[PDB]
């Protein structure tokens, strides 16, 4: 994909995550955790809802009949009508196929970008206290308990608190 996270460096999705679209899993001394990110989840949902509001609708124009169901109209004008309707039908079929194909591409890539923006937000927070493992996880080089893990999810993790301890473990 365009941004390289979903169907990319993140190997696969989590069927066990039923309370959100994006989220965190972690492991520390205290336990194994899972939690959904509301902000990135809702950002993706709102954008898709906006498309549905835009796409799922019809025109206000009042169309009357120009073709009798139960009687035969004049032959020459009937051919002009048949030609014109088939031309308009080809335009709308093409427009519909393009619309959905375009939007499906953008929806998939938008979702991919939200995964990346969360990953990048976490990377910049952790600073020199963690390293990327390639699979979408961060190996944290200090003791990071449940409150520490929560602060990363809450976007209030302070890297300076653990910097000295982390640099010693990384250099070994």
């Amino acid at each position: 994909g365009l941004f390289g996270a979903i169907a990319g460096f993140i190997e696969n999705g989590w069927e066990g995550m039923v309370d959100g679209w994006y989220g965190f899993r972690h492991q520390n001394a205290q336990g194994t955790g899972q939690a959904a990110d509301y902000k990135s989840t809702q950002a993706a949902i709102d954008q898709i809802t906006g498309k549905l509001n835009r796409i799922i609708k019809k025109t206000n124009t009042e169309f009357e009949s120009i073709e009798s169901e139960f009687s035969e109209i004049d032959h020459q004008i009937g051919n002009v009508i048949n030609w014109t309707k088939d031309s308009i039908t080809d335009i709308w079929t093409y427009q519909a196929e393009l619309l959905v194909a375009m939007e499906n591409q953008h929806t998939i890539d938008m979702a991919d970008s939200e995964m990346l923006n969360l990953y990048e937000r976490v990377r910049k927070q952790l600073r020199q206290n963690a390293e990327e493992d390639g699979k979408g996880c961060f190996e944290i080089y200090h003791a990071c308990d449940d409150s520490c893990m929560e602060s990363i999810r809450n976007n209030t993790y302070d890297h300076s608190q653990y910097r000295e301890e982390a640099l010693l473990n990384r250099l070994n």
């Binding site: 965190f24 009949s65 519909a96 944290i140």
Partner: protein
């Protein structure tokens, strides 16, 4: 060895296939349909003052065919025409037939105004026929009068009838021309003299000649009564000059306002609401496209040559 935090996204067992710009078999977590496939096999008339004509044809409302007796006047925002609707009890047709039918199906009602046409003692205006049955007896088009000579064989007198439109809206006037089956019939009804019918207003004029000629029997009758029509503007007069053959109007019509014409076979339903109709029923969908029929009326989804178009409402589904 170290503590770790992993970023990820949800997935589902029940994936759905959608088409993108680059891929025709792309799996996503959720998707929704944009083309309506199913139709309600009923005419949804909630919030509509409607007229179901049954076996009455719209043109029959103006001339007054027996099947149209309960639909001679009225008001409506939706007018429904059915298959095999009876317009003419007597053999014949209307000139500019489809244009007249389309005008009636665009209107929002019909009002009837008397012509006030009177005829002298030598004219019999109560001509009837077995082709136009009404309560098991011979009758005629309710809004017209079959004029013939009172004495069989004698010449129909040179008659003049004029209608004046006293209203502020335009009036639709219809008349008929009888084309006899044979010369013997023609002489009995109108006399041996040469027949000539002339109509004339400010905006319209024409001459009609009754035609005796060999032709097959429709419902046992080789005769024909063809109809013609025009719009008389406010204040204008229309004059009929004739000496045998005219089927003269006793009333004229006034099309009131606007309405939605529907041609359909489906039964009526007053509980359901709709703004889009077709031959086989109604289309209530909120979706932008439909594949039911290219011929629809009202505020409709656009027709497309596609069974399904799935819009993705979710990310790529990457299971395991």
């Amino acid at each position: 060895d170290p503590d770790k935090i992993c970023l990820g996204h949800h997935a589902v067992a029940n994936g759905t296939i959608v088409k993108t710009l680059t891929n025709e078999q792309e799996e996503v977590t959720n998707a929704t349909e944009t083309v309506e496939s199913t139709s309600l096999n009923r005419l949804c008339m909630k919030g509509r003052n409607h007229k179901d004509l049954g076996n009455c044809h719209p043109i029959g409302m103006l001339i007054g065919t027996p099947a149209c007796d309960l639909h001679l006047t009225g008001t409506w925002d939706t007018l429904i025409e059915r298959k095999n609707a009876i317009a003419y009890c007597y053999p014949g047709a209307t000139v500019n037939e489809e244009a007249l039918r389309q005008k009636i199906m665009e209107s929002g009602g019909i009002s009837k105004i008397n012509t006030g046409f009177t005829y002298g003692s030598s004219i019999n205006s109560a001509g009837t026929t077995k082709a136009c049955m009404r309560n098991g007896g011979n009758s005629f088009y309710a809004e017209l009068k079959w004029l013939v000579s009172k004495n069989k064989g004698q010449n129909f007198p040179q008659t003049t009838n004029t209608y004046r439109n006293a209203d502020t809206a335009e009036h639709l006037i219809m008349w008929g021309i009888h084309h006899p089956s044979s010369t013997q019939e023609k002489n009995d009804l109108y006399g041996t003299q040469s027949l000539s019918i002339s109509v004339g207003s400010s905006t319209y004029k024409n001459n009609f000649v009754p035609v005796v000629g060999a032709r097959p029997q429709v419902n046992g009758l080789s005769s024909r009564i063809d109809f013609h029509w025009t719009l008389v503007q406010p204040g204008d007069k229309i004059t009929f000059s004739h000496n045998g053959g005219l089927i003269a109007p006793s009333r004229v019509s006034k099309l009131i306002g606007r309405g939605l014409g529907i041609q359909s076979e489906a039964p009526i339903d007053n509980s359901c609401e709709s703004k889009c109709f077709w031959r086989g029923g109604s289309i209530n969908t909120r979706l932008p496209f439909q594949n039911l029929s290219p011929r629809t009326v009202g505020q409709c989804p656009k027709y497309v040559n596609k069974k399904s178009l799935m819009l993705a409402t979710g990310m790529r589904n990457v299971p395991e």
